[PDB]
């Protein structure tokens, strides 16, 4: 891709003590318009990996086919090892630094969520191949709104309980549907735990337009 | 943003979306872009918030000065034309994509569109700003001469919900006003208050 | 235009000692305005004699340091033998200059031991251009860094100053000191110092507190 | 492409200027004068655009001639090369900046000899010797490495050919010829030309 | 930079600074611009530090292959013309590169300028770099082919020295080398801030 | 820069940092980014620092002239007003962006002002390259009527999200309080910030330097 | 870059009861060396001076200009200008050029002509003042500047001190700047004398 | 150009106008814009004229194949597939805004957009082309789920309408295609046929 | 900047060059040679671009020499003059366009004397005499003015003067030297170089 065309904004990720969870909205925008207003934006890789997409959804939809098919072939094997969500985040950022290095992008930037072996991995991987690891990461408006909020917290208390994260990613969802002209106020949050992966929505947070009677 | 406008028998209905973007990020999600001109005369802003704003002051000056040295309320017609007189003139300089719209005793409810470039057409109802695009259709298909005051407030809030939920650049509160003889009444539908459609699901 | 370059900052150190080399970074990544985050450093072990530094564009070091990872391997194989400092250098000039026509978008600095056993930092160019230091600052807040290490571990402008050898204690206080002096006024540079020291022991590792705004 | 060059010795200033007015690929005047006499013991050297270097000059020139008819005596050195600077500082910026660079040269009663250098931005520094052009870069090392402060006249005049040799020699340039003044106590003196 | 070199009777003497620069940032003021291709032929650096690095190493590597496949030294005119053979199809690509190629062969004393431009002339004297210029008034001034060795010397020290003093981009201290007839040999480094002390109008 | 303004019970709460860059380096560590308009109207400035401080010194000059005259304290309306008739008459040239906030005859008011002369009169606002920072924590948080130590907190934890995420911002969190009643003015408010220590010394004695010549001239 | 067409870098630094400032000595075109001794720091006062960096030519306007409307100031007004007045008219002159700049970004060091207190500033070419209580840096070498300046300034020291300081922090910025330098110049201001000094300097 | 296509239980409606420009010359007013890629599969065409038909010849004769090698009718998800993959592959160097609609004995009634860069979406209804723009608000209030196929049919044949009314690039006829188990039905609306709205002059 | 020329007579062609090898402002070398020996009685006079003037040269040179080892006899100036333009005609449109701009020279036992011209887009004219460079916009006309197709081999020296004399007067750049050789039935031969 040299011009995306329908694309998704934020995707936002933290870790919780046994797991991460990931939330993004269902949009698909073209410019301006809200064009695709059910589309989802994670998948589930295996079953101790996620991925959500910011940028172009036809290049997230083959990143999509080309990771589901090394997943299967994998399976077929049947040998006991697997991709962890750490090889899968290295995996990626080769991808995409190669796209990169022929002047032809992947134009996405992409949260990976994990656990394995009792560890909880979140890594960013950019359309550049600039990749790395941190307890929360939020792409594009995400990263101006979210990401303070959730570094506040993080300072705060470094090790947060699933239902903590939980609600602390939707306070964030709603200041980026406030604020963010490309969201929407319909999302799904994805987590990993033990268990596998769980992709949660259509979800939406509640509003609040008091401020509305207090031009002040 | 999407602007609209509706002429009844007796007034208008006027309605605004309420954001403020700089590319896109929100810089106010509670804008009131229906701005009071004189007792029953508003206009709707769109395009530039700065180009917008002072237009709007300067034809509040000069409609009340001549209001004033005639001692009469003005006409609906006239606030329209020192907008047009205005963005005309300045249509090089300017982003402003106005509809004019109130009521005065000689010819009753009135709007007026002056589009960017300064050209200005009476309309038994305008629509404007970049959502207005997403409401053609729905506008041409529902429009029914001689719908009443609440009618024209449904139309308005349906209108302007559909526009908002497609374009990027329009959303948060819907601002209504109604202007008749009898004064000016405003309101605001939030939240739950916005008329809602179904996302098709399979 | 889509740009294949990002600068994601960073600022990289190195000096040599008569039994011992330094590396040390700040571990902020950066994009425009923004942290990407605050505990990213940018010293990389290559064998137990030999630390690079790398800053730059952020996309570039993961490559080129895993590709430097490679070939060490490579040499090993077929050698039968960990590559030298010297040879770990010269080699990445070479490395460099591949890409002479889309650069590597990297600030390097290599120190370690030399065959001897004595302290040796090389500094390179994004393109391979190299040579041997004795101290040498890289990235970002390189400008702040030098002048200083030129002064008080060059000796330059002093007269009626004894040329004392360099010790480790007088290094790592150096190192701490321009760091700190280097965060007050680099955007980029920030959040923690961390230092590498290579002796004939091993390589152990020091973190130090920088300001986070 | 216009040379100008200027020595200042314990009682003197020596200059030199080519000779060639140029266009294109020939060369129209072997016999040209860049030196403007501003005053009995000033000479302005001046290079730069067509049109500019001439209307500036000559208004420099009339304007120091106007404050001898004015007031009786002349302008120093120093004071015409901060009124030469005023002028094209304050032109910098305008409607009509003047693209021109210029070497001052004088000597006063009570200062002795002065050499000033001036570019287009109208930066001006004194300095003991001075060039301009691209025949500049080819002999200023020549000046820094045989010039002393003492300089005699004989020595400074050896200087300075050794200068328009290394043109000869080294520049792809042909400028032939020179025109040489020196300025002391007793005013401005032509000297003879200095040519191949 | 400021490179020089000048044939005469007593063979070739060969100088420069040891600046470099990203852009007004000087980046180093110790770099070795003079290479030793082999013990009688050695090369100059000015242009892009890398890409006079690279080109003039693998010049000495393929100086080595030729001299173990021909059992003979190669002459100043091959070592010179491999280089700018390597170099030509580089064209208009952004290399930049002006060398000086010196030694001692069995036409004599020998010595060729070769750039990424694609020129390579055989010549008594040259100057290369962003301070040549200032560097060609002083030697053109003192340069003689009965040039005693040690007055050969001071001239080549004196013209970079000079080179320094104007050109921002040169400086550090002055590298000087001779190529005799039984190889080159290093006979000094001198930094600018000791020579300013010493000389000299 | 993170600017922002909060409007509370019985007032205003304005708050900033105190850093300046030029390029991506920092030129101030201490910067005053909250200025003077009248006795009860203050004024954040983001954008060219030479803009902020000039525009606001003139309006703070007229509005003193005004005051004068009219023997009354200034509004806040009226000091927007002039703001924004001279940013659009210069067309977004002079690159100031303000939070504006006082407490007059008609209570408290705040409003945001941009260069190209826009202005938004809003209950809580923010400004500058940390303004997203600011105005996450605002969302957030904010609620109507606080109390003047809630608003406080509120405001400095608004300004210390732009400190720590925005390479724009750092230093101190400056505030200032405006009610009916008072005026606090509260330089620094927070130094979340510092230097670390110098581990060695570099105090140099006399004669390190080498000096080529010297000239005393004795004064009166 | 307009600012390094001339290259150039002026400080100045604040001690106990006195005060510093210091500049490089090149005037150059580019690459080319012009002159060796050109002055870039102008006495506004008996304790008060402004050093200028940045083009050559605006170093000059600015300082002329400068001094005619202080000159004009002191003989209105009873008096020698205050240090922070003089800022301010400074401020005033290159802000007027808001829209077409001199490209000149002064320092300016003095001791208030009455209570004798440090005092030091910067401007940027628009005119946006910065006071500080320790240093202050202009010129193409402004990072190598900061980092000396970072690591050696300290509170309250003697003229002797000061001196050592400032010109330790000049000689090594400028000496990784390739268009600065060519020798430095120092003013100590104190109370009861004005020491000038030029400092043995590399000459590349 | 608008183009759409509706979901109902046992088959899609497809529309399109049919109107082609070069700048704002007509080069042709009766345009066929719903291309059949099998016997029951169609695509409905939008963006470059020269573009659109040559993909979709290209996914008939790629279809075609395929469907004689298993010996059984083709899926409207693998047509839709195929269309997706090379507008995708090559959508540096294409113009094509497709949908994709048809009925199979497997999934029946289905619905597909490829937009502009590749991506591909099932949907209850889709919209496309310029004057899809137009009409968002109108489908969006009008929608309702459990739809007859003559209701679709007049729900395309409004929308359409109402774009080809208001957008430059749209205009002429409307063509419909009703596509279900028992086959394909097509048909023409023009002139008087085409639902009218009044321009609202003025009281 | 490089000139070319040649003047052929009714049994010989005399052709001068310049000497000259520049770079910047700078004469770098001058004692530069400009001619390549093809064949005994076949000079090529080759200038441009720098890498590209040498390299074509070079090749042509090799070429024509190899033909005369495989053959036996040497390729006629008519044959290396077509030879030489197919080479540059080809490269035109190719990845690696040669910018070089030629005489050729040349004694051929059954047609006598020939000089040809060719330019870096590979036109080539035969003609009693040319020029290259921009020199010749300065010297052709002399050539027109008292070229004869008899003139004597001691006239073409001095017509070829006078051209060389019009250069040190007229033209802007500093071309002292020049390199003189004269093609016949007995082969090459140099004269004297002609120098100021
Ligand atoms: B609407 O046309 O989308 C809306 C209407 C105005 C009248 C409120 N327009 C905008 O939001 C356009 N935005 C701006 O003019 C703007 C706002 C801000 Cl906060 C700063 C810069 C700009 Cl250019
Ligand atoms: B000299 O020509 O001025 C010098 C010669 C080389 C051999 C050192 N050249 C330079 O200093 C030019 N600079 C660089 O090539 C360079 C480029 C970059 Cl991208 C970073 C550092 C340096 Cl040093
Ligand atoms: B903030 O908006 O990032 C801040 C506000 C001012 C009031 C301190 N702005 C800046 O730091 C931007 N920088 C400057 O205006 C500036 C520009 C120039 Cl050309 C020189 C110096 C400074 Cl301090
Ligand atoms: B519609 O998207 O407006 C329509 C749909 C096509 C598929 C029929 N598109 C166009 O009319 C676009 N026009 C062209 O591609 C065209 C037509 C002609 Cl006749 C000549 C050149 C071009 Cl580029
Ligand atoms: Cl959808
Ligand atoms: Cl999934
Ligand atoms: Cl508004
Ligand atoms: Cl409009
Ligand atoms: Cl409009
Ligand atoms: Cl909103
Ligand atoms: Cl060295
Ligand atoms: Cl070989
Ligand atoms: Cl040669
Ligand atoms: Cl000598
Ligand atoms: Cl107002
Ligand atoms: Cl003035
Ligand atoms: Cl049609
Ligand atoms: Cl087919
Ligand atoms: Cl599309
Ligand atoms: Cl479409
Ligand atoms: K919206
Ligand atoms: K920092
Ligand atoms: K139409
Ligand atoms: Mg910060
Ligand atoms: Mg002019
Ligand atoms: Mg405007
Ligand atoms: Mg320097
Ligand atoms: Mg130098
Ligand atoms: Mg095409
Ligand atoms: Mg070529």
Redesign the interface.
């Given at each position: 891709t040299?011009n995306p065309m329908v694309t998704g904004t934020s995707v936002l990720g933290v870790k919780f003590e046994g797991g991460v969870v990931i939330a993004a909205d269902m949009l698909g925008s073209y410019g301006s318009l809200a064009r695709f207003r059910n589309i989802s934006r994670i998948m589930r890789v295996n079953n101790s990996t996620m991925l959500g997409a910011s940028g172009d959804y036809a290049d997230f939809q083959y990143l999509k086919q080309v990771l589901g098919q090394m997943v299967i072939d994998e399976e077929l094997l049947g040998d006991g090892h697997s991709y962890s969500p750490r090889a899968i985040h290295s995996w990626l950022?080769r991808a995409m630094?190669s796209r990169?290095?022929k002047?032809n992008?992947l134009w996405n930037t992409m949260v990976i969520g994990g656990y394995a072996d009792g560890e909880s991995f979140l890594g960013?991987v950019?359309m550049?191949?600039?990749?790395?690891?941190?307890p929360s990461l939020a792409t594009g408006y995400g990263?101006?709104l979210a990401?303070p909020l959730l570094r506040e917290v993080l300072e705060k208390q470094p090790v947060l309980s699933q239902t903590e994260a939980r609600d602390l990613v939707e306070r964030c969802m709603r200041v980026l549907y406030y604020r963010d002209a490309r969201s929407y106020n319909r999302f799904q949050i994805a987590t990993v735990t033990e268990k596998g992966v769980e992709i949660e929505g259509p979800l939406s947070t509640e509003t609040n337009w008091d401020i509305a009677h207090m031009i002040s | 943003t999407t602007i609209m406008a509706v002429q009844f028998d007796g007034g208008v209905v006027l309605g605004a979306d309420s954001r403020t973007t700089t590319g896109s990020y929100i810089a106010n999600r509670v804008t009131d872009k229906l701005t009071p001109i004189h007792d029953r005369i508003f206009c709707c802003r769109s395009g530039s918030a700065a180009d917008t704003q002072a237009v709007a002051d300067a034809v509040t000056y000069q409609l009340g000065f001549h209001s004033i040295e005639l001692n009469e309320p003005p006409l609906v017609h006239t606030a329209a034309s020192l907008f047009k007189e205005m963005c005309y003139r300045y249509r090089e300089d300017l982003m402003a994509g106005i509809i004019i719209a109130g009521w005065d005793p000689q010819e009753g409810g009135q709007v007026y569109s002056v589009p960017m470039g300064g050209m200005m057409v009476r309309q038994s109802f305008a629509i404007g700003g970049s959502g207005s695009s997403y409401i053609y259709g729905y506008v041409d298909a529902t429009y029914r001469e001689g719908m009443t005051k609440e009618e024209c407030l449904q139309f308005t809030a349906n209108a302007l919900a559909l526009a908002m939920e497609r374009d990027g650049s329009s959303g948060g509160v819907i601002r209504l006003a109604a202007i008749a003889e009898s004064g000016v009444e405003r309101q605001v539908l939030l939240g739950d208050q916005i008329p809602k459609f179904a996302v098709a699901t399979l | 235009r889509?740009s294949?370059?990002?600068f994601?900052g960073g600022t990289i150190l190195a000096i040599a000692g008569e039994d011992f080399a330094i590396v040390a970074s700040d571990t902020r990544?950066?994009?425009?305005?923004?942290?990407?985050?605050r505990?990213?450093p940018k010293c990389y072990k290559l064998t137990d004699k030999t630390v690079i530094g790398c800053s730059g564009?952020?996309?570039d070091c993961?490559?080129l340091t895993k590709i430097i990872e490679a070939r060490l391997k490579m040499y090993k194989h077929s050698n039968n033998k960990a590559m030298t400092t010297g040879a770990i250098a010269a080699m990445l000039?070479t490395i460099?200059?591949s890409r002479?026509?889309?650069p590597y978008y990297v600030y390097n600095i290599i120190g370690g031991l030399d065959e001897e056993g004595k302290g040796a930092v090389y500094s390179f160019?994004p393109?391979?251009?190299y040579?041997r230091?004795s101290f040498k600052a890289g990235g970002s807040?390189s400008?702040?860094?030098?002048?200083?290490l030129?002064?008080?571990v060059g000796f330059?402008?002093?007269?009626?100053?004894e040329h004392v050898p360099l010790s480790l204690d007088?290094a790592?206080?150096?190192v701490?000191?321009?760091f700190?002096?280097?965060?007050?006024?680099?955007?980029?540079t920030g959040d923690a110092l961390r230092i590498c020291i290579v002796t004939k022991e091993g390589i152990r590792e020091e973190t130090?507190?920088?300001?986070?705004? | 492409m216009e040379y100008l060059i200027g020595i200042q010795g314990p009682d003197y200033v020596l200059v030199a200027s080519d000779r060639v007015a140029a266009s294109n690929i020939v060369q129209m005047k072997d016999d040209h004068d860049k030196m403007f006499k501003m005053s009995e013991k000033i000479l302005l050297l001046c290079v730069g655009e067509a049109g500019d270097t001439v209307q500036f000059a000559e208004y420099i020139q009339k304007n120091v001639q106007l404050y001898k008819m004015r007031n009786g005596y002349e302008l120093s050195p120093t004071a015409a090369a901060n009124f030469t600077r005023r002028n094209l500082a304050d032109c910098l910026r305008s409607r009509t900046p003047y693209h021109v660079n210029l070497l001052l040269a004088g000597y006063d009663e009570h200062e002795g000899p002065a050499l000033y250098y001036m570019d287009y931005l109208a930066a001006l520094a004194k300095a003991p010797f001075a060039a301009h052009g691209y025949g500049a870069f080819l002999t200023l090392s020549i000046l820094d490495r045989y010039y002393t402060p003492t300089i005699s006249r004989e020595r400074a005049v050896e200087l300075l050919r050794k200068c328009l040799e290394e043109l000869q020699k080294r520049f792809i340039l042909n400028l032939p010829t020179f025109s040489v003044r020196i300025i002391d106590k007793n005013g401005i003196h032509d000297l003879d030309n200095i040519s191949f | 930079t400021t490179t020089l070199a000048f044939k005469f009777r007593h063979g070739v003497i060969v100088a420069a600074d040891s600046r470099?620069t990203?852009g007004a940032?000087i980046?180093?003021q110790?770099?070795?611009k003079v290479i030793e291709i082999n013990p009688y032929l050695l090369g100059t650096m000015a242009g892009?530090?890398?890409?006079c690095?690279?080109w003039e190493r693998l010049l000495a590597r393929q100086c080595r292959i030729y001299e173990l496949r021909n059992k003979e030294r190669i002459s100043v005119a091959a070592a010179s013309k491999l280089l700018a053979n390597m170099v030509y199809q580089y064209k208009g690509?952004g290399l930049s590169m002006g060398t000086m190629i010196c030694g001692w062969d069995k036409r004599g004393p020998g010595l060729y300028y070769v750039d990424s431009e694609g020129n390579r002339i055989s010549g008594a004297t040259f100057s290369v770099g962003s301070g040549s210029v200032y560097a060609y008034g002083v030697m053109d001034r003192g340069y003689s082919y009965d040039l005693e060795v040690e007055q050969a010397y001071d001239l080549a020290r004196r013209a970079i020295y000079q080179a320094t003093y104007r050109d921002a981009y040169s400086g550090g201290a002055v590298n000087l080398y001779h190529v005799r007839e039984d190889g080159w040999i290093r006979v000094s480094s001198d930094n600018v801030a000791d020579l300013h002390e010493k000389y000299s109008g | 820069t993170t600017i922002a303004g909060v409007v509370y019970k019985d007032g205003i709460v304005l708050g900033a940092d105190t850093?300046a860059?030029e390029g991506?380096?920092?030129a101030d560590?201490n910067c005053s980014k909250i200025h003077f308009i009248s006795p009860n109207i203050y004024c954040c400035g983001a954008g060219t620092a030479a803009d902020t401080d000039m525009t606001t010194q003139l309006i703070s000059s007229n509005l003193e002239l005004h005051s004068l005259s009219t023997g009354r304290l200034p509004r806040v309306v009226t000091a927007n007003r002039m703001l924004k008739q001279m940013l659009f008459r210069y067309q977004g040239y002079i690159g100031a962006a303000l939070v504006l906030g006082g407490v007059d005859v008609t209570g408290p008011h705040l409003y945001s002002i941009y260069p190209h002369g826009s202005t938004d009169k809003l209950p809580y606002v923010t400004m500058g390259?940390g303004s997203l920072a600011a105005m996450a924590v605002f969302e957030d948080k904010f609620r109507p009527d606080m109390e003047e130590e809630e608003a406080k907190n509120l405001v400095s934890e608004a300004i210390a999200a732009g400190?720590?995420?925005?390479?724009?911002?750092?230093?101190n969190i400056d505030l200032c309080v405006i009610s009916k009643n008072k005026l606090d003015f509260l330089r620094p408010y927070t130094v979340?910030?510092?230097?670390?220590?110098?581990?060695?010394r570099?105090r140099?004695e006399k004669?390190?330097?080498?000096v080529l010549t010297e000239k005393i001239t004795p004064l009166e | 870059s307009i600012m390094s067409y001339n290259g150039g870098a002026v400080m100045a630094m604040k001690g106990k009861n006195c005060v510093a400032i210091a500049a490089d000595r090149r005037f150059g075109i580019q690459a080319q060396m012009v002159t060796t001794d050109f002055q870039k720091i102008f006495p506004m006062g008996d304790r008060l001076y402004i050093g200028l960096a940045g083009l050559a030519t605006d170093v000059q306007t600015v300082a002329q200009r400068l001094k005619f409307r202080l000159n004009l100031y002191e003989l209105k007004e009873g008096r020698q200008i205050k240090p922070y007045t003089l800022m301010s008219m400074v401020a005033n002159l290159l802000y007027e050029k808001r829209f077409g700049p001199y490209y000149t970004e002064p320092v300016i060091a003095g001791l208030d002509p009455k209570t004798f207190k440090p005092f030091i500033c910067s401007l940027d070419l628009i005119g946006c003042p910065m006071v500080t209580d320790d240093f202050v840096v202009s010129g193409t070498?402004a990072?190598?500047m900061?980092?000396?300046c970072?690591?050696?300034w300290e509170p309250n020291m003697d003229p002797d001190h000061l001196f050592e300081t400032i010109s330790?922090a000049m000689?090594?910025?400028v000496?990784?700047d390739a268009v600065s330098g060519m020798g430095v110049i120092v003013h100590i201001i104190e109370k009861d004398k004005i020491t000038t000094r030029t400092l043995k300097?590399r000459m590349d």
């Open positions: 040299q950022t630094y990169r290095s002047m992008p960013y950019d550049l191949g600039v990749a790395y690891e941190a990263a101006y990401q | - | 889509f294949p370059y990002v994601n990544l950066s994009e425009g305005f923004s942290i990407h985050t505990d990213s564009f952020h996309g993961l490559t000039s460099l200059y002479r026509f889309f160019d393109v391979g251009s040579q230091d807040a400008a702040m860094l030098q002048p200083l030129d002064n008080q330059k402008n002093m007269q009626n100053v007088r790592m206080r150096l701490k000191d321009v700190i002096s280097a965060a007050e006024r680099d955007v980029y130090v507190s920088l300001r986070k705004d | - | 470099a990203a940032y980046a180093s110790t770099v070795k892009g530090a890398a890409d690095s690279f690509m | 850093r860059t991506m380096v920092v560590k390259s400190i720590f995420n925005d390479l724009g911002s750092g230093s979340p910030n510092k230097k670390g220590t110098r581990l060695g570099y140099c004669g390190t330097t080498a | 070498c990072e190598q900061y980092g000396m970072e690591s050696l330790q000689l090594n910025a000496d990784r300097a």
